Each structure stands twice: as structure tokens, then as C-alpha cells.
Amino acid sequence: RSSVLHSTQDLFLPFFSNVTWFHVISGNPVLPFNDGVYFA
Amino acid sequence: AYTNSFTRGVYYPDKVFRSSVLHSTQDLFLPFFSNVTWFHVIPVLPFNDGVYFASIEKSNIIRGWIFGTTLDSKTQSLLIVNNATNVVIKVCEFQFCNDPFLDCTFEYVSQPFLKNLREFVFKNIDGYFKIYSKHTPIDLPQGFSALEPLVDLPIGINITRFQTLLALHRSYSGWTAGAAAYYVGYLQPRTFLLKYNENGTITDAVDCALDPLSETKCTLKSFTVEKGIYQTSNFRVQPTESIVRFNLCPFDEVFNATRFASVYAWNRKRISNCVADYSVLYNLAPFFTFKCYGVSPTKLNDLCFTNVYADSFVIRGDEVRQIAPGQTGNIADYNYKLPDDFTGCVIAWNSNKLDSKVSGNYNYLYRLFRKSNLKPFERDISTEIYFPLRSYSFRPTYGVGHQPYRVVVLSFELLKKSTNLVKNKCVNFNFNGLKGTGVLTESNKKFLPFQQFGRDIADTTDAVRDPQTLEILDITPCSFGGVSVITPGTNTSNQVAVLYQGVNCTEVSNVFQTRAGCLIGAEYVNNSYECDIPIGAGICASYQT
Amino acid sequence: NFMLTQPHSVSESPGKTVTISCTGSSGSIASNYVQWYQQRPGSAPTTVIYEDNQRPSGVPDRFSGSIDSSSNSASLTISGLRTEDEADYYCQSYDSGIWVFGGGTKLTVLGQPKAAPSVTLFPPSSEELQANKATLVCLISDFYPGAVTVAWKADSSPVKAGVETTTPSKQSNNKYAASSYLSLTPEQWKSHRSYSCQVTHEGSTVEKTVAP
Amino acid sequence: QVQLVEWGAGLLKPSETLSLTCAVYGGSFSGYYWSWIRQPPGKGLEWIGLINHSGSTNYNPSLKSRVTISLDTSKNQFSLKLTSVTAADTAVYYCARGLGIFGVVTLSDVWGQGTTVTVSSASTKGPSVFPLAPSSKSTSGGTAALGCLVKDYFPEPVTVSWNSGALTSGVHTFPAVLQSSGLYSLSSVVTVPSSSLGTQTYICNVNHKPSNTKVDKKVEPKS
């Protein structure tokens, strides 16, 4: 869309949230996959 | 030749009566200024949507009519004879002569309808034959008759043509009898505006869309319209043609692949969502045999196919003939089954130039012996052995039946769109859907590679990318707008000047272009006069006289 | 070995339905398309037929074709005949990838009453016999439409050695005229005594014979 | 609707190449097999070739050695080349569209107009009329056929009358006859009754305005 302000509902990562930061080289169980998973 | 009909074909619309009533109605009318063929010279009339039949003669020349497509035993027809004593209708598919002259189960007798005017109407509406009758004593004059209904039969037979009947006092060329005149007017579904006087009869009729004056009268539902600007309808440009459009289609490996699989491991691939690359060399396209049903090139404009199914198997040359619909033998049963309503195209070609080996090719096998026919769409991965299997011998010195043959069957299951494109013209554009109407011009829009199409305010898209050559087009919904009918009043004259709203007629009497649109029927003067009828965007009107 | 044959002369009054066929010779005509054509005077045919039964946009919906597998023959049919469609129709088929044409059909819309052929037969001039030359001309005039085929016979045996047919065309009074240039030798004139000029107009054949 | 037109040099000579150009109006080249169709006048066709948007082409083997087609999307035009033109090359040529499978050109669904392309390389010659004398015998029908033929002349038309046009009853003016030499073969035959035959004078007059060549020959029944 071109030069137009919108508002959309969907599965988003809500702002200002704490995501779990894990280093896998130290210290595997099941990680829950909810409705929407933002992985990095 | 031909001649125009001024005011013929008026009758009570609803077959019901009103007193002192002006009223606009639509029905099976004779439109104003319709064609009638004068038959004055020193005759078969087709029944299109109803025939308004008029006769002018001093005496009774016309004897009747013979309706019906063929008037034979196998074709339903009809005869009407109107005698001075009684009128007889025989709807029984009776046989009629080609040159009329006078000396089944159905039969019908009713009262006779009657330099002499006689009008009649035959109407074939809603499975019903309507007859109106009228008799009066007498360029076309404005002769008027509120044609009251007479008869409405509920029977429907194929009535297409009829011809008048002439019977002489004596005959076998012949006597110099008179040349009667009759006019035929084909009925059309049309709407008019009528006025009924205090005694309650039709007296004044106006076509709703004869003139802009006629249209403003039909708008106000009246017959006296003051001087002013009136809004009737809108000019909508016809959307010319409909243009339909669809990162490589892998059509190359379906047939021209160097190696193919055997019959059991048939390969099926769906191909779509890519630019259709059909130019890749396969066999120089030496297509001498082709006939396909179900799919046709014409429908690709208005049909988009969902899937492309390809099925492959391996056979030999002297057995391709037996692989067809309605074929019997062990070859089709044990190799491949063809459905009755096969929807697709058959492709068979020589492959000796590619599948020739000096030491022989053993990579093509086929099942010749089995307990039973394989089920349709059956999947088998077993390797159980029934040498049990024989491989084709491919030698240059063998017969034509030993030539290698690659055979593949393409099918289209309807559980991809069509090409073509135009520019700079108000057309109906479709791109795998996205059905829109408007002008596609050069676009001031520049997108990003995934940006497929853009939108403006009010959810009206601005640009489209070309699926074929990847170019971006600007869309504006078609150039159209209302019409305002400058009319100085029926008291003064009948000269209409019609303004189209917000349309440039430079790109579709004297025609002027103003900020409001396109003013035709107005001789644009530049002089200063006081305003009477404001036309729009700062322009007004006056009467030249 | 595909050969394409079409009827020489087909005539139809305006408004009625006329059909022209192209019979298959070698093989089953169903596998190979047979396309029906049209040639106006000074024009050339185009391509309008595929799958044998469809009519496109930009072309009248009256030109219709068909191929029937029962008689192994083709067909092109006209329903709404008009005088403008005066065109010579030819058939083209595919011969194992070779584009092979046919003899064609000459179609004419009746504008004049039908005229029976007029045939006259005379021996050549006796002055040229000294040069051992003898060419034969057979007259075909006052026949409408203009479509005839000249069949020569040599003692009740057809011969087509040096036939030079001519194209009929309108005369000063709109009627057609045709001829057939026959070439033979003066030696066989002494050995032969019965020669006939069979001309086929419509379904009628009229011949004349001379003897030494 | 799409309109197809053709234009080019209509007078050709042996041993050079045919060039003809076609331009498209209101159309696109997507999904069409644009082709050219050829027919010598009077005789049957000889299909030229085909081309689609990407340029894939197929030619008749009799012309493949001599024909070439090109497509120009930039100029929205496609042209025809045909090398080593012969007497068999004299024909009208059109451009046309197509709808089929990979080069099945059978719905060029718009009639083409085209030009007249003829091979003309010769010289003017003098006519030599010869007598087509009748048999001068009592036939079954009492009518005698008298005629005269014109040879070694170019081009059509040639107007022939009888007795300066006075004889009109039996006169039958013919069209030109297409030979292989390259000249027009005209002949006029008049039908006269046997009763009026033997002494009356019949002359057929050859007339040609361009070359100012008139021939008046009297043909006798028999000698």
C-alpha cells in the first residue's frame, strides 16, 4: 500500500516484552510453540 | 426501402383503467421512430418479439394469416382466417401452401373482428398468444388508438413467420387486383410515459429515452417541463475489451527431459504460478495430429484453470494406436486405462533420434503379463517378480514397430490464467482475478520487487505489475459522469443541451469542454449574458433564438 | 501419399445453405486437420478453422465447417449466403508433418439464370498441316456459373496429354467463357477417327465428335 | 478487434529477395502465432511460415530454403523475407495472427487484405494474329464458329471487336489465358449462322490504347 496509515489486528510480538535468551553451548526439553512464535 | 413510424403502437399498459391519470410504464411496446417496410410497388414477416400489423385498404383484401415455423406434420403451426361472417383459428400444425389463395384435432371459431385502416397485434409473451384488434375508417400521420386487449390464448407453439392471404373472384399471373399496403412493427420491451384525460383514455405518449427532452419529461413524469437544469441519467463509457494477464515454468523437462521413468513410477507435476515458457525447443513442434475436447483456446480469456496434471508411461510404436478411448485388448488393460470423458490433449511423437544407443538401451521396461489390471491411481512399491520382463530392442535395422517412443498424457482436473493486454483505454482488466474496470496508463508508481500492487485512499487500487514482462500500470476507474439536460422549456422550444459530468470528451452540434465536463448540444458562446440556467463549474445558458 | 479432392463446381442460390467437402485419400482423415479456405478474385485464402467447428470474433458466425469420420471426408458449410462471399474454397491437410494443399472448389453465387454449355468442334487449319503441327481448341461459352471441366476421349478412352484449360470470366454481357487447348500430332490424326470433347457443367455433359 | 495490414514493393524481378512489412493495430503479441499466407492467383496456396512472441518459427520445407520471418516488438511489426524469387513466387502476400499449440496457425481470425506482388521482367513485343478458320461444313447446328487469337503481346487488357463492333450477335470476348511463357493469350470467337456465310466479310480488330498497336485481320472460312 502507498502512503496510507493503517491499523491491522494479527499475531504480533507485543512491544516492550522480555524474550528468553538462551545460550545452547552450556548447561534439552520441549520448547512450547504457542499460536505465534518469534524465533531468532 | 424503409420508413419511420411516428406514434404507432400505443395501448393500455396493464389492461386496466385509470381516470385522469398521468403514468409511466414499461411493457412490450413499439418503440418510437421504429422501422416499418412500406410495401407500395407497381412478404414473409418474422415474429421476433410480437408483431404490430397495420393495413390500409378500401376493401377487404387480406383474408388472414398462416403462422408457424414450417406448417408441416412435424412442426407446430397455426392458421387464422378472418371472414365477413366469422374468424377461424386452427392451431393444429396444418400444411399450408406457398402462394396463398382460397376459393389434426384443434379447431376454433369466434366473432369477426370487423381507404380503411385495420390494426392488429400478435404477442408471444409468457407462454401466451395475445391478440389485439382495431378498425378505423380513413408521410405517416399521427393516427392514435388506445388498443384495448381482445384475446389471450394460453397455448405455446413455434410461431416465427406468417404471410397475408389473397383470394380472387376467379382464377386458374391473373387479374389486375389491387396492391394492398401493410406495415409490420416488431415489438420490443420498452417504457413510455402516458397521459389519460378526465374521461379516461390514452391521449399523449412520450418515449422515455427518445430525446433528452423526452428523457426529462419521463423523469418528471409529466408533459410540461419548465426552463431549467434537470438530471436524468449518467454516461458510462463501455469498458471496450476485457484484458486478462497471468520464476520460470518448468515445461522443458515434461517431454524433452533426457531420461523418463517407467510405467509404474509415473511422474505427475503441477505447473503454475510462473511465466508460461512454451518456446523451449522440444521437437521443432511438428504438430500434424491434434484434436482435444473439453479445453479450447477461446475459453482461456474467461476461464482460469486450477491445476496442470502430467502423466507419463513407456510403450512401443506399433501399440500406440491401441491406446485410445474405446479400445480393447491386453495392451490398454495392462499398461494404461483411458477414461471415457478424458479432458486433456494427446501428444505422441518419435524419439529415435535421442533414445538411440550403440550398445542398446535397457532402461525402458513395461509390464506385459499380470494377474489383473492395475487400479486407477494405484501406488505399488513391491518388487515381487512374476527373463520374466522383456526390454525393447532398439536397432536401426528393425521395422518401424521397433522404434523407441516417448508417450506422455496431460490432463486438466477442475476441482493458471489467460494472456493478452491493452493499454491507455477504458477496459476491464483482470490479473488472476482482481476484476476491475478503468483506464490503465503509464504509472507514476515505482514499487519494490515483492510489491505486487498498490492502493489509494478508499480502497481503490492504483497500480498493477505485469506478470509477464514486469511493468507497472496506473489504474483509474473509467471516465464517466452524469448528464444534465439544459432545456429552456417546452413552452419556448425543444432544444436540449446535455452536459456530461466530469468527463473530458477531447479524449471521449458544437461540443464545448468546461471544468464540469463535456457540454454537447450547446453552441458555446463567449459573450456576456445574465445567467438563467446554471450549467456548472461557472458556466450558464441562454436561448439564442 | 495424402491427396486432397474437392468438388469442381458447387452452385447455390442466395439465402440457402451450401456445403463444400474435401475427401481424404490416404489414411484416416480424423487424425489430420482439413482446413477450408476462401479466395476472392485477386485475393488469397486465410486460416479460420481449428477443431473444425468454432467461429471466432471478427468473422461472421455463418461460415461453419465439419469433419465426419464415417465417410472419411471433410465439409465447410455456409448458412447465411451473401453475394459478397464469391470465393474459391481450397482444402489443406497435414501429410506426416508436410503441409499439403488440394485442388480446391470454385464457389459462385447465382446472379444470372443458369446457362447450358455451348460446344462446337472444328478441325484445325489445313495450311499449317505442312509444318506437322495440330493444336485443338474446344469452345465453352454461354454458361453460367463459369465452372466446367473438359474431358478428352481417344476412341472411348480418356486422355489428358496436353490439356490447357482456361479460367471462365465474365464477357461484355456478364456471362462466362472457357476453352481447352489440346495438343496432339498429325500422325495420330490418321490412326484415330473418333474424338470427343466432354465438358462437365454442373452434372450435365455435352460432347461432339468429328472423323477424317 | 485487431486490424492487420500489408504493404511493400509489388513489382519484383528474378534472382532477388521478396521483402514485405506488416504492422499491428490495437493488439498484443502475447500468446499468438503470427504467420504469413501465400497464394499464386488462380492456383492454390503455399503457406509461408509462422512466428510467436518468443520468435519460435516453423517453415514449409519448400520455402524453408528460401523464406525468413522476423518479429519486432519494439516497432510492433513483423516482416517477411523470401529469397530467390521465381516465376512461382508471383503471388499476393498477407500477414496474419494465429491461435494454436506451439505453432498451429489456423485461426488468424481476421481477414487480410495484402498487396499484389508480381514478378515482371520482360519487354514489349508485337502481336501476330493468326486465322482460326472454321470447317465451313454443314454442321448439325447451322452455326459457324469464327475466331482470331492474339500472340506475343503484353500486357492485358486487349479489346477486340468484330466489323468495328458492328457484328455483335455471336461475338464472344474471352479473358486472358495464363500460360507459362509470361504473356496474355487472348482470343475472340463469333457465332454466325450458316445461311449467312461464304462471302460476307468478318474482321476482328485488335486494339490497345497504351502501345498504340492495332491489328485488323480478315479470316476466311476455307480455301
Residue B448 in contact with residue B412, Cβ under 8 Å?
Answer: no
DSSP character string of B462-513:
EEEE-TTT--EEEEEE---EEEEEEE--TTT----EEEEET--GGG----EE
C-alpha cell at B222: 409529466
B471 touches chain A (CB under 8 A): no
* Residues D98, C47: C-beta atoms closer than 8 Å: yes
Amino acid (1-letter code) at residue D155: P
C-alpha cell at D43: 492456383
Residue bearing cell 456459373: C145
Q: A6: distance to nearest CA of chain B, Å?
A: 11
* Residues D102, B420: C-beta atoms closer than 8 Å: no
B419 touches chain D (CB under 8 A): yes
Residues of B in contact with A6 (CB under 8 A): none
**Exposed, middle or buried by CB within 10 Å (0-12, 13-18, 19+), for C149?**
middle
B161, B298, B323, B350, best to mutate vs chain C, most C CBs in 10 Å? B298
Peptide bond into C145 cis (omega under 30): yes
Residue C131 in contact with residue C153, Cβ under 8 Å?
Answer: no
How far is residue D114 from each of residues C106, D87, D138, measured CA to CA in Å? 21, 19, 53
Residues of D in contact with C39 (CB under 8 A): 39
Distance between CA D10 and CA D174 in Å, rounded?
A: 27
Residue in D closest to C42 by C-alpha: D41
DSSP character string of chain C:
---EE--SEEEE-TTS-EEE--EE-SS-TTTB-EEE----TT-------STTT---TTS-TTEEEEEETTTTEEEEEESS--GGG--EE-EEEEETTEEEE---EEEEE--S--B--B-------SSGGGGT-EEEEEEEEEEBS--EEEEEEESSSEE-SS-EE------TTS-EEEEEEEEE-HHHHHH---EEEEEEETTEEE--EE--
Distance between CA C178 and CA D178 in Å, rounded?
A: 12
D2 touches chain B (CB under 8 A): no
Distance between CA C3 and CA B46 in Å, rounded?
A: 45
Nearest CB to D45 within list C92, C141, C177 = C92
**CB atoms near residue B56 (< 10 Å):** 15
How far is residue C136 from each of residues B175, B276, D14, D95, measured CA to CA in Å? 56, 63, 33, 43
Nearest CB to D102 within list B285, B421, B468 = B285
* Residues D99, B290: C-beta atoms closer than 8 Å: no
* Residues D177, C179: C-beta atoms closer than 8 Å: yes
Peptide bond into D155 cis (omega under 30): yes
D49 touches chain C (CB under 8 A): no
Nearest CB to B296 within list C31, C51, C96 = C51
Residues of D in contact with C169 (CB under 8 A): 174-175
Chain D from 91 to 130: CB within 8 A of any C CB: 91-94, 96, 98-100, 104-112, 114, 116
Residue C35 in contact with residue C100, Cβ under 8 Å?
Answer: no
* Residues C179, D116: C-beta atoms closer than 8 Å: no
Whose CA is closest to D98, among D56, D60, D52, D58? D52
Helix (H) or strand (E) holding B253: helix B252-255
D1, D3, D28, D64, best to mutate vs chain B, most B CBs in 10 Å? D28
C-alpha cell at B26: 414499461
**How many Cβ pairs within 8 Å bridge chains A and B?**
11
B279 touches chain D (CB under 8 A): yes
Residues of B in contact with C97 (CB under 8 A): 286, 288
Elucidation technique: cryo-EM
How far is residue B345 from each of residues B289, B325, B342, D2, measured CA to CA in Å? 11, 13, 9, 29
B454 touches chain A (CB under 8 A): yes
C-alpha cell at C212: 477424317
* Residues C127, D94: C-beta atoms closer than 8 Å: no
* Residues C47, D35: C-beta atoms closer than 8 Å: yes
Residue bearing cell 469542454: B513
Residues of A in contact with B445 (CB under 8 A): 2
Residue B44 in contact with residue B160, Cβ under 8 Å?
Answer: no
Residues of A in contact with B457 (CB under 8 A): 4
Residues of D in contact with B278 (CB under 8 A): 54, 102
* Residues B296, C54: C-beta atoms closer than 8 Å: yes
Residue B176 in contact with residue B485, Cβ under 8 Å?
Answer: no
Distance between CA B244 and CA C82 in Å, rounded?
A: 36
Helix (H) or strand (E) holding B333: helix B330-335
Strand order from edge to edge, sheet including C164-165: C134-143, C176-184, C164-165
Distance between CA B96 and CA B125 in Å, rounded?
A: 25
Q: D3: distance to nearest CA of chain C, Å?
A: 10
C-alpha dihedral, B207 to B208 to B209 to B213, nearest 10°: 90
Tell me if residue B217 falls in helix, strand or coil.
Answer: helix
Residues of D in contact with B282 (CB under 8 A): 102
Chain center to CA of B386: 61
Number of Cα atoms under 13 Å in the Cβ half of residue B467:
23
Q: Which residues of A make CB contacts under 8 Å with B?
A: 1-2, 4
Chains D and A touch, contact meaning at least 3 pairs of CB atoms under 8 angstroms apart: no
Classify residue B202 by its DSSP letter.
E
Distance between CA B102 and CA A16 in Å, rounded?
A: 103
> In the 3-class helix/strand/coil scheme, how is B80-110 assigned residue by residue?
EEECCCCEEEECCCCCCCCCCCCCCCCCEEE
Strand partners, B464: B453, B473
Tell me if residue B184 falls in helix, strand or coil.
Answer: strand
Residue B160 in contact with residue B66, Cβ under 8 Å?
Answer: no
Phi, psi of B505 (to 5 degrees): -85, -5
C-alpha cell at B305: 484453470
What resolution, expressed in A, was reported for this entry? Answer: 4.3
B290, B350, B400, best to mutate vs chain C, most C CBs in 10 Å? B290
> In the 3-class helix/strand/coil scheme, how is D35-92 assigned residue by residue?
EEEEECCCCCCCCCEEECCCCCEEECHHHHCCEEEEEECCCCEEEEEECCCCHHHCEE
Q: D35: distance to nearest CA of chain B, Å?
A: 15
Q: D216: distance to nearest CA of chain B, Å?
A: 49
Q: Which residues contact B466 (CB under 8 A, 6 or more apart)?
A: B245, B421, B472, B473
